[PDB]
Each structure stands twice: as structure tokens, then as C-alpha cells.
Write an enzyme that holds these catalytic residues in place. Structure first.
Site, PDB file in Angstrom:
ATOM      1  N   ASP A  69     -37.005 -11.009  51.056  1.00  0.00           N
ATOM      2  CA  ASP A  69     -36.000 -11.180  52.099  1.00  0.00           C
ATOM      3  C   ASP A  69     -35.651  -9.731  52.446  1.00  0.00           C
ATOM      4  O   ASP A  69     -35.034  -9.055  51.629  1.00  0.00           O
ATOM      5  CB  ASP A  69     -34.781 -11.947  51.539  1.00  0.00           C
ATOM      6  CG  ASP A  69     -33.550 -11.943  52.435  1.00  0.00           C
ATOM      7  OD1 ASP A  69     -33.641 -11.432  53.571  1.00  0.00           O
ATOM      8  OD2 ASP A  69     -32.492 -12.441  51.996  1.00  0.00           O
TER       9      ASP A  69
ATOM     10  N   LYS B  94     -32.809  -2.630  60.429  1.00  0.00           N
ATOM     11  CA  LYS B  94     -33.181  -3.951  60.953  1.00  0.00           C
ATOM     12  C   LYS B  94     -32.574  -4.194  62.347  1.00  0.00           C
ATOM     13  O   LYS B  94     -33.134  -4.953  63.140  1.00  0.00           O
ATOM     14  CB  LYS B  94     -32.735  -5.036  59.964  1.00  0.00           C
ATOM     15  CG  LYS B  94     -33.351  -6.408  60.256  1.00  0.00           C
ATOM     16  CD  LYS B  94     -33.153  -7.325  59.091  1.00  0.00           C
ATOM     17  CE  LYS B  94     -33.351  -8.737  59.519  1.00  0.00           C
ATOM     18  NZ  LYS B  94     -33.142  -9.651  58.370  1.00  0.00           N
TER      19      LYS B  94
ATOM     20  N   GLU C 197     -36.073 -16.771  58.432  1.00  0.00           N
ATOM     21  CA  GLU C 197     -35.077 -16.851  57.345  1.00  0.00           C
ATOM     22  C   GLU C 197     -34.535 -18.293  57.186  1.00  0.00           C
ATOM     23  O   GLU C 197     -34.541 -18.783  56.054  1.00  0.00           O
ATOM     24  CB  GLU C 197     -33.916 -15.863  57.586  1.00  0.00           C
ATOM     25  CG  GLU C 197     -34.280 -14.415  57.273  1.00  0.00           C
ATOM     26  CD  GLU C 197     -33.477 -13.350  57.999  1.00  0.00           C
ATOM     27  OE1 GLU C 197     -32.352 -13.640  58.463  1.00  0.00           O
ATOM     28  OE2 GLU C 197     -33.986 -12.214  58.108  1.00  0.00           O
TER      29      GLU C 197
ATOM     30  N   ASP D 273     -25.442 -19.271  57.851  1.00  0.00           N
ATOM     31  CA  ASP D 273     -25.722 -17.949  57.304  1.00  0.00           C
ATOM     32  C   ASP D 273     -24.661 -16.920  57.645  1.00  0.00           C
ATOM     33  O   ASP D 273     -24.652 -16.391  58.752  1.00  0.00           O
ATOM     34  CB  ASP D 273     -27.110 -17.497  57.790  1.00  0.00           C
ATOM     35  CG  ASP D 273     -27.686 -16.234  57.157  1.00  0.00           C
ATOM     36  OD1 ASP D 273     -26.963 -15.572  56.364  1.00  0.00           O
ATOM     37  OD2 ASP D 273     -28.865 -15.909  57.447  1.00  0.00           O
TER      38      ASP D 273
HETATM   39 MG   LIG Z   1     -29.821 -12.634  55.186  1.00  0.00          MG
END
Ligand SMILES: [Mg+2]
Ligand SMILES: Nc1ncnc2c1nc(Br)n2[C@@H]1O[C@H](CO)[C@@H](O)[C@H]1O
Length: 390
Positions: free
Chosen positions: A12, A73, A177, A201
């Protein structure tokens, strides 16, 4: 005849923290790094003598803000001109430069000014996750599945593969994800028939809701929604402002202009915030916080919940929007999955459970580990090379 194959890993690659897992002996092992941490900060720091990655980079950030890179990211696969990039640059202490309309982070490193592409910074984070895995397995690792947000476009996905290739990894697949979190619970192994799954999330800086449909192990992303300005750091900010006011009332002193005192207060607030997820109160004890004054205080979970009440309630707006976009009613959702450390907050869980009329939330896999867990399950599936019997 045929040598035993090395295990493949699931990574991840997160905005703030990264996590690595391996599926062996019918189960996933989330691998702790050499400081005993099951998640590793996605940070890279540069000095005259070293390049530090993970906990070592994050632990020296206070005195080296210009040469410690985080949030790569948010830049990966984007153009320098993109409005998202331009706004984010105002919050970062490191330099972001324009190279042919492509962002690069510019730092002082080993006596020179050096610029790196976001994929190069991410490859450094991936090199550390590969080394964490090799320290546990006791042999070199080649194969990996890397996860990305469901909203990542082709350029963002190709730049993530490029980061893997620079790190010496063979990227088996780039997976979403929310799909990886669903795989972690085996939600793709429930047989024939359609299942609607909502992934909730809540990260350090952003909030994402995804609705997936699963039919005979096939995943379809039905809707995505969220809030780019909602995360764990906002709850820390509310505690910081509360304790700054409290110090003002009690000692008639404003600490807000001593960066060290604010940082020490914020570090203590984030730990107190974590304690409040398991306890009904938490103590805050800082020695010589400002002008040699010791700051020994406490905060109840009820007061913390009141401080962040509007922020926690606002997580339900993207949930209702995602349900409208997917054209589904809340009763039609079969499974609710929690992702991100901030989902351990009891009030966040209560609000969501109440919204879905008392339904159980899947939270048995540590929410900060569920994505790597599912990526590790997928990685073991992708390297199988079984030949059919007669
Ligand atoms: Mg995450
Ligand atoms: N037990 C926990 N209760 C509340 N919050 C938590 C917990 N554990 C983690 Br991890 N967090 C927060 O999750 C985010 C991950 O980037 C950060 O904001 C962390 O503070």
C-alpha cells in the site's frame, strides 16, 4: 526439478504512510519495519551525508523542513500547471519546480542542489518497503502488487508502475485501494450473485468513499466521492487550538509563536487523540512547554468529540452523494469496510453505523493495514502457475 519461488508482496503506497504484507501459510503477515512499526512514513530526507527513508526521515523533519519530502503521491502523474498542484505547493516547506510542465522536488543533497521527479521519490519509499519484506523473508523479493486510489487516471497509474521499476520491483499489477480492502475481507469469494460494498476511507489528510459491485469475483467501481479537505490532521488542529486557548486562560501566555512549543503541543495532541479511541479520557503532560512552564492537563473523549463534531458529521455528505451517484439506497449496501487509522474514532464509527441503521462495520483487519493485506492476497494469486490435471 523446479526451485521454490520467492513470495510476492503487497504494498500500500500511501500518501502519508505505506504498508507491506505477504500471504504465506494460508494467511497475510503485515511486516513491521526495524523500529517495530507496521506502517512506515512515506518520507524521504536529504542531508550532506545521507538519504533517510521512513521513520528516520520523519523523526528529523522539524529541523530539516526544506530537504524532507512527503506527499509525493499528490504530485505523481500530474502536470505542474494542474490547479491541485499549485494549491498544494503553498502548504509544503520543500521546493517544487517546473521542468517542462512536470513537477520536480528540489533539495540540497550531498553538497549539491538536486531535483527529483515524484516517481523517483516514490521509488525510494518502495525500496524501503522491499527491504522491510526481505528482512522478514530472509531472501531477495522481486514481485509486488502496488495499490492506487480508484480515481487515478492512466498517467498516474503508469507513473506508479515506473516508481516500482526504478525500485527494482516487477509490478505484477496496479490495483485500486478500495478493491484491495474488499479482497482483504474475501468479499470477492462469496460465490454467485451481486454484492454492493461501500469502502469508507478516512486518512491523515483526505477522505474517500467508494461503492463497488462484486459479481462472481468481478469488481466494478460504481461511484467515488470524498472530501480533499477532511482528515486526521484537521482533528489534531482542533485539539491544538483548544490547548493554545487553555494555556492562555491558565497562564496568561500565548504560545502560538514558538514553533517548538506548537510542534511539541501538536505531537502530544495526536497521541492523546489516539488514546481517546480506546479510553474515555487522556492526559497531556509536557515539561517546560513555554517560558519554563510545565503543561500538565487532560481532555475527555466527550470534549474531543465536541471539538471535532462538525468534521465527523461531514463524512456523511460524500456517503449520501456516492449512494446517489451509484443510484442505490443505503439498505442495498451488503458490506461496509473501514480504511484508515482515523476510522478507529468511536464517534466516526457510531455516526456511520447509525446512518446504516445499526449495521455491523468490517473493521477486524486493522484499518491502516487492510489495503496492503488485500494487495498481498492478490500478489500470491497472480504468481500461481498451476498446470491442469487430465
Ligand atoms: Mg490509504
Ligand atoms: N487509534 C487511532 N485513533 C485515531 N486516529 C488514529 C489512530 N491511529 C491512527 Br494511524 N490515527 C490517525 O490516522 C492518520 C493516519 O495518517 C493520522 O492522522 C493518525 O493520527
Amino acid at each position: 526439478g523446479s526451485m521454490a519461488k520467492a513470495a510476492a508482496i503487497g504494498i500500500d503506497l500511501g500518501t502519508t504512510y505505506s504498508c507491506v504484507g505477504v500471504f504465506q501459510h494460508g494467511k497475510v503477515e503485515i511486516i513491521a519495519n526495524d523500529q517495530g512499526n507496521r506502517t512506515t512514513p512515506s518520507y524521504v530526507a536529504f542531508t550532506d551525508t545521507e538519504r533517510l527513508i521512513g521513520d528516520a526521515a520523519k523523526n528529523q523533519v522539524a529541523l530539516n523542513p526544506q530537504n524532507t519530502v512527503f506527499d509525493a503521491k499528490r504530485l505523481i502523474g500530474r502536470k505542474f500547471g494542474d490547479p491541485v498542484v499549485q494549491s498544494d505547493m503553498k502548504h509544503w516547506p520543500f521546493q517544487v519546480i517546473n521542468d517542462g510542465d512536470k513537477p520536480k522536488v528540489q533539495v540540497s543533497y550531498k553538497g549539491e542542489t538536486k531535483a527529483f521527479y515524484p516517481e523517483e521519490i516514490s521509488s525510494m519509499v518502495l525500496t524501503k518497503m522491499k527491504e522491510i519484506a526481505e528482512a522478514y523473508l530472509g531472501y531477495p523479493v522481486t514481485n509486488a502488487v502496488i495499490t492506487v486510489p480508484a480515481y487515478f487516471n492512466d498517467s498516474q497509474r503508469q507513473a506508479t508502475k515506473d516508481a516500482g521499476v526504478i525500485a527494482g520491483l516487477n509490478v505484477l499489477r496496479i490495483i485500486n485501494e478500495p478493491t484491495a480492502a474488499a479482497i482483504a475481507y474475501g468479499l470477492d469469494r462469496t460465490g454467485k450473485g451481486e454484492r454492493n460494498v461501500l469502502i469508507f476511507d478516512l486518512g491523515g489528510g483526505t477522505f474517500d468513499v467508494s461503492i463497488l459491485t462484486i459479481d462472481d469475483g468481478i469488481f466494478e467501481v460504481k461511484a467515488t466521492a470524498g472530501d480533499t479537505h477532511l482528515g486526521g490532521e484537521d482533528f489534531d488542529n482542533r485539539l491544538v487550538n483548544h490547548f493554545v486557548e487553555e494555556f492562555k486562560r491558565k497562564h496568561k501566555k500565548d504560545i502560538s509563536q514558538n514553533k517548538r512549543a506548537v510542534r511539541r503541543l501538536r505531537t502530544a495532541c495526536e497521541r492523546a487523540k489516539r488514546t481517546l479511541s480506546s479510553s474515555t479520557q487522556a492526559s497531556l503532560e509536557i515539561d517546560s512547554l513555554f517560558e519554563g512552564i510545565d503543561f500538565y492537563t487532560s481532555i475527555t473523549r466527550a470534549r474531543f468529540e465536541e471539538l471535532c463534531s462538525d468534521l465527523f458529521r461531514s463524512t456523511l455528505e460524500p456517503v449520501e452523494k456516492a449512494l446517489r451517484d451509484a443510484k442505490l439506497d443505503k439498505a442495498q449496501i451488503h458490506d461496509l469496510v473501514l480504511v484508515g487509522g482515523s476510522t478507529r474514532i468511536p464517534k466516526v464509527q457510531k455516526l456511520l453505523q447509525d446512518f446504516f441503521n445499526g449495521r455491523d462495520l468490517n473493521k477486524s483487519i486493522n484499518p491502516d493495514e487492510a489495503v496492503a493485506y488485500g494487495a498481498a492476497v492478490q500478489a500470491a494469486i497472480l504468481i500461481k502457475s498451476t498446470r491442469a490435471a487430465a
